[PDB]
Amino acid sequence: WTLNSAGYLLGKK
């Protein structure tokens, strides 16, 4: 697992 502000695995533009 990783800590992200925008997304780690999911995130569509």
Swiss-Prot record:
Changing residue 6 to E: In ETL8; decreased affinity for GALR2; but no effect on affinity for GALR1 and GALR3; decreased activity in GALR2-mediated signaling; dominant-negative that inhibits GALR1-mediated signaling. It comes from the Eukaryota. This is Galanin. The gene is GAL.
